[PDB]
């Protein structure tokens, strides 16, 4: 399947959810990228203008792609595998309530999973994997990838 064929990857935050402090959105997304750069040769840079490899978007309902969102609950986010254009992009449902903690839906934890997709990972059948298709809050301060996640990503990079 598609992978990025270069080590320096850019991302851009298209718009910010009103659910969170701006700096907290920046940090959650940065930390989520760091999870993957920790176990690959990839380096991620936030850019403020221009065309990024990975565009991070908050949107609700129909938002121009073919994966319309569904209101509060259900689908929380979706992302596209590596490629030109929309490839790599990660979309977060604004009808969720995004947070830094265990309330609402945790942006960091959701973003770790979405960026996994942005890098070319699919879903895991292992409930312990961040790439498992079901969202479940785990303590974000001690968060770690499962062996399955690490095997998955290192089958694609490094
Ligand atoms: O990547 N998106 C999905 O897998 C769709 N399911 S979900 O939005 O409920 C979701 C999102 C993120 C992590 C687990 C599950
Ligand atoms: Ca939803
Ligand atoms: Ca893109
Ligand atoms: Ca919201
Ligand atoms: Zn979308
Ligand atoms: Zn997913």
Curated annotation (Swiss-Prot):
<comment type="similarity">
    <text>Belongs to the peptidase M10A family.</text>
</comment>
<feature type="binding site">
    <location>
        <position position="113"/>
    </location>
    <ligand>
        <name>Zn(2+) 2</name>
    </ligand>
</feature>
<feature type="binding site">
    <location>
        <position position="96"/>
    </location>
    <ligand>
        <name>Ca(2+) 3</name>
    </ligand>
</feature>
<feature type="binding site">
    <location>
        <position position="93"/>
    </location>
    <ligand>
        <name>Ca(2+) 3</name>
    </ligand>
</feature>
<feature type="binding site">
    <location>
        <position position="53"/>
    </location>
    <ligand>
        <name>Ca(2+) 2</name>
    </ligand>
</feature>
<feature type="binding site">
    <location>
        <position position="123"/>
    </location>
    <ligand>
        <name>Zn(2+) 2</name>
    </ligand>
</feature>
<feature type="binding site">
    <location>
        <position position="117"/>
    </location>
    <ligand>
        <name>Zn(2+) 2</name>
    </ligand>
</feature>
<comment type="function">
    <text>May be involved in tissue injury and remodeling. Has significant elastolytic activity. Can accept large and small amino acids at the P1' site, but has a preference for leucine. Aromatic or hydrophobic residues are preferred at the P1 site, with small hydrophobic residues (preferably alanine) occupying P3.</text>
</comment>
<feature type="binding site">
    <location>
        <position position="96"/>
    </location>
    <ligand>
        <name>Ca(2+) 1</name>
    </ligand>
</feature>
<feature type="binding site">
    <location>
        <position position="63"/>
    </location>
    <ligand>
        <name>Zn(2+) 1</name>
    </ligand>
</feature>
<feature type="binding site">
    <location>
        <position position="19"/>
    </location>
    <ligand>
        <name>Ca(2+) 1</name>
    </ligand>
</feature>
<feature type="binding site">
    <location>
        <position position="85"/>
    </location>
    <ligand>
        <name>Ca(2+) 2</name>
    </ligand>
</feature>
<feature type="binding site">
    <location>
        <position position="75"/>
    </location>
    <ligand>
        <name>Ca(2+) 3</name>
    </ligand>
</feature>
<feature type="binding site">
    <location>
        <position position="89"/>
    </location>
    <ligand>
        <name>Ca(2+) 2</name>
    </ligand>
</feature>
<feature type="binding site">
    <location>
        <position position="71"/>
    </location>
    <ligand>
        <name>Ca(2+) 3</name>
    </ligand>
</feature>
<feature type="binding site">
    <location>
        <position position="87"/>
    </location>
    <ligand>
        <name>Ca(2+) 2</name>
    </ligand>
</feature>
<feature type="binding site">
    <location>
        <position position="91"/>
    </location>
    <ligand>
        <name>Zn(2+) 1</name>
    </ligand>
</feature>
<feature type="binding site">
    <location>
        <position position="94"/>
    </location>
    <ligand>
        <name>Ca(2+) 1</name>
    </ligand>
</feature>
<feature type="binding site">
    <location>
        <position position="73"/>
    </location>
    <ligand>
        <name>Ca(2+) 3</name>
    </ligand>
</feature>
<feature type="binding site">
    <location>
        <position position="78"/>
    </location>
    <ligand>
        <name>Zn(2+) 1</name>
    </ligand>
</feature>
<feature type="binding site">
    <location>
        <position position="65"/>
    </location>
    <ligand>
        <name>Zn(2+) 1</name>
    </ligand>
</feature>
<feature type="binding site">
    <location>
        <position position="70"/>
    </location>
    <ligand>
        <name>Ca(2+) 3</name>
    </ligand>
</feature>
<protein>
    <recommendedName>
        <fullName>Macrophage metalloelastase</fullName>
    </recommendedName>
</protein>
<feature type="active site">
    <location>
        <position position="114"/>
    </location>
</feature>
